[PDB]
Amino acid sequence: LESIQCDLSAFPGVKFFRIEAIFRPWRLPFVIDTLSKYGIRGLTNTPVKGVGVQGGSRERYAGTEFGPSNLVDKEKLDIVVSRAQVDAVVRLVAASAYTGEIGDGKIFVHPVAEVVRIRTAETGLEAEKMEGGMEDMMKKKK
Amino acid sequence: LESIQCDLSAFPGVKFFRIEAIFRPWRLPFVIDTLSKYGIRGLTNTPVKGVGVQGGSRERYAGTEFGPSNLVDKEKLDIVVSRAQVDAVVRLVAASAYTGEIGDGKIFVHPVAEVVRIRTAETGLEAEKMEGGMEDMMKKKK
Amino acid sequence: LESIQCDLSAFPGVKFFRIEAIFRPWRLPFVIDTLSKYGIRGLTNTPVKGVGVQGGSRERYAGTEFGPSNLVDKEKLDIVVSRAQVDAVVRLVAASAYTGEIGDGKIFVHPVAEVVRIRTAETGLEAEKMEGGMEDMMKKKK
Amino acid sequence: LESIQCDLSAFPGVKFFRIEAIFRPWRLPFVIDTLSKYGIRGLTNTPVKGVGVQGGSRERYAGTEFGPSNLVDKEKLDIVVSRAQVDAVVRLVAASAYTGEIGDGKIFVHPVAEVVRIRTAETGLEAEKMEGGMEDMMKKKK
Amino acid sequence: DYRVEILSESLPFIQKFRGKTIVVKYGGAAMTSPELKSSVVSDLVLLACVGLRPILVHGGGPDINRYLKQLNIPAEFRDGLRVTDATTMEIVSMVLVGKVNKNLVSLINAAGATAVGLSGHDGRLLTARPVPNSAQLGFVGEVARVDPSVLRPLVDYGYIPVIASVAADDSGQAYNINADTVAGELAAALGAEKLILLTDVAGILENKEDPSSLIKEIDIKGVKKMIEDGKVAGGMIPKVKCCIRSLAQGVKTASIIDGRRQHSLLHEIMSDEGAGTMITG
Amino acid sequence: DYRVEILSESLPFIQKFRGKTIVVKYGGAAMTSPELKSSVVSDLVLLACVGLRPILVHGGGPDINRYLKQLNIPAEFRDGLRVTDATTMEIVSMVLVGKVNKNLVSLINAAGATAVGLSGHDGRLLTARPVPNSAQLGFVGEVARVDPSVLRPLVDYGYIPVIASVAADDSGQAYNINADTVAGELAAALGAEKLILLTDVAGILENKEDPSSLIKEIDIKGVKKMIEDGKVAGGMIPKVKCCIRSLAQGVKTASIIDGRRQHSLLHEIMSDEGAGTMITG
Amino acid sequence: DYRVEILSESLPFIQKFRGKTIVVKYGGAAMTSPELKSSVVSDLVLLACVGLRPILVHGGGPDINRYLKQLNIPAEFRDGLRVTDATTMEIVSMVLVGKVNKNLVSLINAAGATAVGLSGHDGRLLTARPVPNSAQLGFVGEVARVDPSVLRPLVDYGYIPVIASVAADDSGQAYNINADTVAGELAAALGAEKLILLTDVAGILENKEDPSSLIKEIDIKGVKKMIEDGKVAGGMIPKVKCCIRSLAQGVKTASIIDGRRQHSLLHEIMSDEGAGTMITG
Amino acid sequence: DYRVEILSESLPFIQKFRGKTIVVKYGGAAMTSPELKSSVVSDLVLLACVGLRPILVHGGGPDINRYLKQLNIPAEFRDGLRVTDATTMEIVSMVLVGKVNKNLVSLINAAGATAVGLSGHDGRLLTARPVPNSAQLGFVGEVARVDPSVLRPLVDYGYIPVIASVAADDSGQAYNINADTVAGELAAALGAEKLILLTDVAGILENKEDPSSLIKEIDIKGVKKMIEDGKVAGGMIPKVKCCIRSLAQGVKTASIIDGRRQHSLLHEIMSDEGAGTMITG
Numbered sequence A, B, C, D: 001l002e003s004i005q006c007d008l009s010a011f012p013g014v015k016f017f018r019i020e021a022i023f024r025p026w027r028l029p030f031v032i033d034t035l036s037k038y039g040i041r042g043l044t045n046t047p048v049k050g051v052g053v054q055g056g057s058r059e060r061y062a063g064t065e066f067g068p069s070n071l072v073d074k075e076k077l078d079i080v081v082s083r084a085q086v087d088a089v090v091r092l093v094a095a096s097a098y099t100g101e102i103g104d105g106k107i108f109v110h111p112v113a114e115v116v117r118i119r120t121a122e123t124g125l126e127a128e129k130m131e132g133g134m135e136d137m138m139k140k141k142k
Numbered sequence E, F, G, H: 001d002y003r004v005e006i007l008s009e010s011l012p013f014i015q016k017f018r019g020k021t022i023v024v025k026y027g028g029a030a031m032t033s034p035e036l037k038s039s040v041v042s043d044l045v046l047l048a049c050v051g052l053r054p055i056l057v058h059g060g061g062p063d064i065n066r067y068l069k070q071l072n073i074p075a076e077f078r079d080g081l082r083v084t085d086a087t088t089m090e091i092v093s094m095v096l097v098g099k100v101n102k103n104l105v106s107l108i109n110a111a112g113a114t115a116v117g118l119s120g121h122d123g124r125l126l127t128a129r130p131v132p133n134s135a136q137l138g139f140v141g142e143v144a145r146v147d148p149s150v151l152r153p154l155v156d157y158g159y160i161p162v163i164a165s166v167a168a169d170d171s172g173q174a175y176n177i178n179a180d181t182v183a184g185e186l187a188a189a190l191g192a193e194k195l196i197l198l199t200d201v202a203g204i205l206e207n208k209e210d211p212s213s214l215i216k217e218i219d220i221k222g223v224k225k226m227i228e229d230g231k232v233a234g235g236m237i238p239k240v241k242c243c244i245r246s247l248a249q250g251v252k253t254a255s256i257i258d259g260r261r262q263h264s265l266l267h268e269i270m271s272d273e274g275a276g277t278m279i280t281g
């Protein structure tokens, strides 16, 4: 878990990816804090509902058990980062959301072409970079 | 409709795509059931609002008629699948959401780089595959 | 601002992109009207919450000041358009959302493979095009 | 006041009198219990409001001070008894309602001609008398 | 371990007054120290958490006196009431509302509860009138009306009210009202179960020179004779008076207790003995 | 006197869990003993007075066994679950609901609070389905649904709910459900802060032979490795499963504590140390 | 086709009692069969859907008697009331609450409505006291108090209440109360429009050996003479008694009808004839 | 007569802002003058009667200075903010809350409406933190949080809130906060339609020397270029900052107007022209 490796080999050239994580609503604050400790502080939350039916088991939410066709509440987090930071971010989310039970969640990684900060008109690397963030923390550690 | 064909030719190499469908809120349960019957049971719903103004006609929701600038309620469904399953899934959603009136909806197909199941740390094909799902049903039919 | 230029050079071949904008909730109607005046009338809104912590400053919403770990309300807008229209659309959103203060927002541009209109089964260029839209307005101006 | 004496000399011949007491609402239960201990257990309560303005002082209820023309809440008790019991009953009520402050209350004594118990059709002395009451308690004390 | 078996033993006491309203007046004179002060707010917050509905009324005469010395303004009391000219009225309102009232609100907020501080002007909670010998006393007020409307939603929302004893007549003129008096009328206005007066003595004393001459319990006829006989005096007069006025309007009990005894408010309610003089009868 | 300075010392503990829901399962030993019985209802009643919102779920296997012996249809158990034919089901519902549940309601009512006893049928609070091993256990149920609607107004009106672990499927057939499981799913259904299980041990030990090897606090990953590594086993593995299932659905904490000790429930909440093994997410 | 024109004809009958409360007591003796039983619940559910507000009170003496035989415990009735020692009380509560009450709740839930089963202990719905000759009868109770608070929110939320006739005194002791008696006091406590008693006879009989000697209508003076004359007897005594007690407290009508006639409850309300003996006068 | 045909002519203006919240800051000149004082409360009271929901935030630097001179601890200012040690803080709270706030409440009450004066401590309406320059200013605060809960029921009951610009941090320390800043953040916290600031100028001029160079209306980008380009400066740059910060958080409009003129507040709302400089998003 602390050593997952995402395959970005169909997207050579691409500088930015979107990590989209879907997990248990009560995990949201632990995930966000973990990411903050490590310098990820640009993220977007959407509450959603979903279905993830494997075989004939049935996941358990609010004491009741949901199967095929029953939407169940989840929290979603979209995090756009630079290629180098992808594996690390995926590992942090996975690790902090984990419980071990079905319905724990899924993470998807998507290619992104451009990033723009509205206040400043910055683009690309300048727009994606956050002062005090993971990148800067590693330079302070170096 | 039952024979739409999506063009994935700008994304050779890519194994996974996200089918994002936006349609009428009261269709949601029929769409989800259709997909379940056919082995698609990993999906994510978000309620949203939108605008789809063609010419000067005006779509009709809750008995009232919405034009430019008026957001109208829709339900969104994100479904990540493997390249082979894309055309089939698009057809099922299209067919079950359809009514014939403006505002019926739009479907977008997006490239996806990686899939991770949090409970197990599985990736790629193992993570995207669902026990009992479309893939397995076709092997049982073979 | 009125001359931002997005970098789409890692996605040669690709015809469609998704402009995903995240900004201040009270801007939503001004942004939507601006886009309507210019012929963008296919868009999707989701209310969301987010975090965009640069350095140690703290953004101010509802009179109170939010820092690391505090989700703050934003409105999101997803707009799928054709390659040619990307820079123009980005500029309109940026310009109309802008205030000058931290938390103004971020815009991301994503590649899209296919577009389908459910009512008609149209695909690609036919599906993405809107009668009366930016494309047609430019032909009427020509 | 342990020795008030009412003047019934304008009503010779009369066997029954109604004692009408108007006092502070919160005294009601203490007055009812005092009467119960001494064998008065036929009585009727009515909540009322009144005015009793002497000179230019102003009685104090619910923290506020009430003068001419301002009704103030009181509880009323009507007790029909036989001639011999009048002075005693009047003394019990006066003593248990008393506080010392203006608005303490007034007692009026009225002549009554007949008493009838509906359940049994008893009249006069039989109708007015209550088993286990003052009269019987004095015979057991004799 | 067994410091739990003693929490258990307090059930009957907590149950007895569950749901009831209790007006507590915090004497300016009992405000001897940042730490005593905070022991009193602790006690209030505990009572609220445990199910009673407490209301704080405060005084502040010494804080006032200190500013009058600083500003070079002479001071006078007659039978426990401060002579109050216009200038002094402004200072009174300044200290009571702007210093004491917010100091207490501020402390409750920091103890994990939430307070709202009001004067009689706020929501027209109190309407004053002059007193017959304003002739002598100046802008000193008697309570003409109490309108507790404004408190209903604050208690509903769970806030603890903290009340300062100044107000205006209908014409809008300010008056200085003795805080014991306000506490007592406010208690009657709310049908409160109890009125509890925290001061700087053990309680009411047989004789004020001797602190072991505490009267443990006394009735109205008894305490009125004490005011005549001359045994209560100065600032203890509007203390006893306001107990009598209050009881007569339906408040079931009234007690006077030492503010500077650690946890005096708690002892008074959560025990049979009590922690000072109780009045009724 | 001192009884008070120690009630004061509980304020922080009372404030920490004010307003929060707490599902407590009462069973086994604690349940036979009358002194532990009324000492457990006293603890519940205190917690409600003090501002927590507690819910009692009870078992009763020993009293069920007594009736089964009387009727010459003696108990049969596999891995801690009772084999339950139709006749036995009727006796189970008779004892749990008609004897234990009401005995507990009855006691709480007489301790100056007010209880409402429910089974899973009542308000459709629980919907059952056959357990994976029906084929051997017969009418033993897993919890398919929890609908807590019926508890909303009862907690609003201030009633203390007391829950018995029987229910039906949609077709209307009764099932016997293990009371730890009901407590755990109910906690998750309400987003409770705590789930507390009164058992007959100290909680979880490093090594089962030594009783001073109590683990005071532990997280999920930690307690899962313990099952894997064998280091706890037996009658404890199911208990620990229902804690895990509960925590993963959002319950903030879950503790297993020694129902044998006087006032165990109070120790667990009103102290840092606690009174058994606590398990966090 | 024209099986609709007969639904139409029932409008006046439905309109007449729209909104009104109706206490129905289901006799233990009318519970002759899984299918009759379910015809009665059907009738209740229909009345609820159609706008009346029905409340079920049940008995269960034969279910009780059957367990007493199995457990080898002797049984006695005096003038329609069961002699009840401590042991028997426990069995009574067990069967009435744990078997009958939940069997009925369970059935209503499965008919597409939702029920909540309560005993008198639950929310302190009933407070019992002994009877003067407990001397002879043991733990048999009279109804001292009815507090219907707990029913208000359940009817508001749309639940159908199902009530079992056991309760406790204030000291917490259980008592066995005849279900007719509970039904009648509960009706008075709610100002119900009707009290309807479903038993195992056509109605009240001129003479109990002859089932065609049904009395169609009778007043209080008349029915009291019947109890004296000796014409009603055993379990029909607390039946007639509870009608009288109820009417005198303001219930407008009371009827006694055959539980085992298909749809007897419906005939009684939705027709002029009725389906047994009606009391008033 | 004609007084009426002109009341009629205000309908459109009254309708436009019906139901909307309006935060008004009262300070400086307008505040000393009694004719402008009562003419400003008259305007507030009219706006509330007519359907707007106004909120008053006040300053009071001149009255604070008077007391500081009296106590020989004279004012010290840097860039418009008062240097505030602990002693000075106490005097600030004393005057703002205990003198100005209540004077204004008192006047409104006497004008036939009803006010409730709050500080930031009350209901925890405001939470402060040290300003970036604490090191020089001492206890001067920036607004860390606004919690408007306590205003919801007061506006529902129809009360007009009057706010004083002091507050505390979470640890319970008092801070002095500039009243323009409080007004601006409060407006944003409520989603108000307007923020209106009574100052001692005509608003914003093209060129500060010429007073007929009034800018009637202007947007953010436009007014930012003005700070950059120097063309307004001085005591106006902070005022304009709090308008910007407010607008960017959703306040629809913000105006700076001439508190010197009679009825300025009415002109600004009940006319197209307005009575100063308006600034839109």
Ligand SMILES: Nc1ncnc2c1ncn2[C@@H]1O[C@H](COP(=O)(O)OP(=O)(O)OP(=O)(O)O)[C@@H](O)[C@H]1O
Binding pocket: A022, A023, A049, A050, A051, A052, A053, A054, A072, A074, A101, A102, A103, A104, A105, A106, B042, B043, B044, B045, B078, B079, B080, B081, B117, B119, B120, B127, B128, B130
């Ligand atoms: N292919 C998919 N596309 C879109 N959303 C998905 C997909 N798979 C899962 N999700 C979303 O992720 C959530 C969690 O899925 P879940 O954890 O059930 O995945 P899973 O593959 O079934 O793994 P597990 O077996 O541990 O449950 C779902 O509720 C849904 O919101």
Ligand SMILES: Nc1ncnc2c1ncn2[C@@H]1O[C@H](COP(=O)(O)OP(=O)(O)OP(=O)(O)O)[C@@H](O)[C@H]1O
Binding pocket: B022, B023, B049, B050, B051, B052, B053, B054, B072, B074, B101, B102, B103, B104, B105, B106, C042, C043, C044, C045, C078, C079, C080, C081, C117, C119, C120, C127, C128, C130
């Ligand atoms: N280019 C687009 N980008 C983002 N969202 C879109 C786009 N087009 C449509 N949508 C979303 O899809 C919803 C449905 O669009 P709609 O069905 O109106 O599309 P359309 O192209 O106008 O087809 P029709 O003519 O049948 O209405 C919209 O309300 C909006 O949520």
Ligand SMILES: Nc1ncnc2c1ncn2[C@@H]1O[C@H](COP(=O)(O)OP(=O)(O)OP(=O)(O)O)[C@@H](O)[C@H]1O
Binding pocket: A042, A043, A044, A045, A078, A079, A080, A081, A117, A119, A120, A127, A128, A130, C022, C023, C049, C050, C051, C052, C053, C054, C072, C074, C101, C102, C103, C104, C105, C106
């Ligand atoms: N890397 C990112 N990934 C996902 N969402 C983001 C990212 N950065 C910003 N957001 C979203 O955009 C919103 C606005 O970000 P914000 O305007 O704070 O960006 P910023 O980079 O900090 O620029 P500024 O310094 O002007 O605040 C956030 O609240 C969040 O919803």
Ligand SMILES: Nc1ncnc2c1ncn2[C@@H]1O[C@H](COP(=O)(O)OP(=O)(O)OP(=O)(O)O)[C@@H](O)[C@H]1O
Binding pocket: D022, D023, D049, D050, D051, D052, D053, D054, D072, D074, D101, D102, D103, D104, D105, D106
């Ligand atoms: N003459 C009267 N006729 C009818 N009712 C009266 C009369 N006097 C008093 N009451 C009623 O009795 C109540 C109490 O009277 P109150 O206690 O004011 O008597 P009072 O004559 O003023 O003596 P006190 O000076 O003690 O106040 C009044 O509020 C009113 O209800």
Ligand SMILES: Nc1ncnc2c1ncn2[C@@H]1O[C@H](COP(=O)(O)OP(=O)(O)O)[C@@H](O)[C@H]1O
Binding pocket: E027, E028, E029, E030, E059, E060, E061, E080, E198, E199, E200, E201, E203, E204, E205, E206, E207, E208, E231, E232, E233, E234, E235, E236, E237, E239
């Ligand atoms: N018999 C008495 N017993 C106790 N205190 C008395 C008595 N007679 C007068 N006093 C005085 O009355 C004062 C009452 O307090 P007061 O000075 O108004 O303070 P506060 O109202 O702030 O408690 C006591 O400090 C005490 O000095």
Ligand SMILES: Nc1ncnc2c1ncn2[C@@H]1O[C@H](COP(=O)(O)OP(=O)(O)O)[C@@H](O)[C@H]1O
Binding pocket: G027, G028, G029, G030, G059, G060, G061, G080, G198, G199, G200, G201, G203, G204, G205, G206, G207, G208, G231, G232, G233, G234, G235, G236, G237, G239
């Ligand atoms: N005059 C009478 N008419 C009808 N039944 C009577 C009469 N006198 C006595 N009974 C008896 O009273 C019984 C009343 O029922 P009871 O045995 O308490 O049953 P339940 O209360 O379960 O309906 C009837 O079964 C019948 O045998």
Ligand SMILES: CC(=O)N[C@@H](CCC(=O)OP(=O)(O)O)C(=O)O
Binding pocket: F026, F027, F028, F031, F058, F059, F060, F061, F062, F064, F080, F081, F082, F092, F140, F141, F165, F176, F177, F178, F179, F180
């Ligand atoms: C299915 C099943 O096993 N049901 C249990 C319910 C009682 C319980 O769970 O409580 P104790 O801790 O006191 O045993 C039983 O039948 O005995």
Ligand SMILES: CC(=O)N[C@@H](CCC(=O)OP(=O)(O)O)C(=O)O
Binding pocket: H026, H027, H028, H031, H058, H059, H060, H061, H062, H064, H080, H081, H082, H092, H140, H141, H165, H176, H177, H178, H179, H180
């Ligand atoms: C920190 C700070 O500067 N506080 C001010 C608050 C008064 C105000 O803001 O009002 P005026 O417009 O009448 O000055 C002060 O101390 O004077």
Ligand SMILES: CC(=O)N[C@@H](CCC(=O)O)C(=O)O
Binding pocket: E027, E028, E058, E059, E060, E061, E064, E080, E081, E082, E092, E140, E141, E165, E176, E177, E178, E179, E180
């Ligand atoms: C009139 C009067 O005595 N007012 C009191 C108010 C404060 C208090 O009661 O402590 C005073 O000292 O001015």
Ligand SMILES: CC(=O)N[C@@H](CCC(=O)O)C(=O)O
Binding pocket: G027, G028, G058, G059, G060, G061, G064, G080, G081, G082, G092, G140, G141, G165, G176, G177, G178, G179, G180
């Ligand atoms: C005291 C008494 O007779 N109780 C009844 C209760 C049940 C019923 O009424 O059917 C009994 O049979 O025990």
Ligand SMILES: NC(=[NH2+])NCCC[C@H](N)C(=O)O
Binding pocket: E216, E217, E253, E255, E268, E269, E270, E271, E272, E273, E274, E275, E276, E277, E278
């Ligand atoms: N002398 C006393 N202070 N007695 C107080 C009585 C104590 C009791 N707890 C009560 O509140 O009524």
Ligand SMILES: NC(=[NH2+])NCCC[C@H](N)C(=O)O
Binding pocket: F216, F217, F255, F267, F268, F269, F270, F271, F272, F273, F274, F275, F276, F277, F278
């Ligand atoms: N070892 C324990 N179980 N401790 C429990 C934690 C302490 C605290 N009273 C609580 O309930 O949160």
Ligand SMILES: NC(=[NH2+])NCCC[C@H](N)C(=O)O
Binding pocket: G216, G217, G253, G255, G268, G269, G270, G271, G272, G273, G274, G275, G276, G277, G278
């Ligand atoms: N003998 C009878 N049962 N008469 C019943 C009267 C019928 C009528 N429907 C009513 O409810 O009042």
Ligand SMILES: NC(=[NH2+])NCCC[C@H](N)C(=O)O
Binding pocket: H216, H217, H255, H267, H268, H269, H270, H271, H272, H273, H274, H275, H276, H277, H278
């Ligand atoms: N110059 C101005 N400030 N004009 C104010 C705009 C006019 C209008 N009365 C309003 O409040 O919206």
Ligand SMILES: NC(=O)CC[C@H](N)C(=O)O
Binding pocket: A039, A040, A041, A042, A043, A079, A080, A081, A082, A085, A128, A129, A130, A131, A132, A133, A134, A135, A136
């Ligand atoms: N999403 C993010 O937080 C990106 C952070 C940025 N890569 C940084 O390290 O500075």
Ligand SMILES: NC(=O)CC[C@H](N)C(=O)O
Binding pocket: B039, B040, B041, B042, B043, B079, B080, B081, B082, B085, B128, B129, B130, B131, B132, B133, B134, B135, B136
């Ligand atoms: N989104 C999905 O449901 C993917 C299902 C997976 N491709 C399967 O067929 O097993």
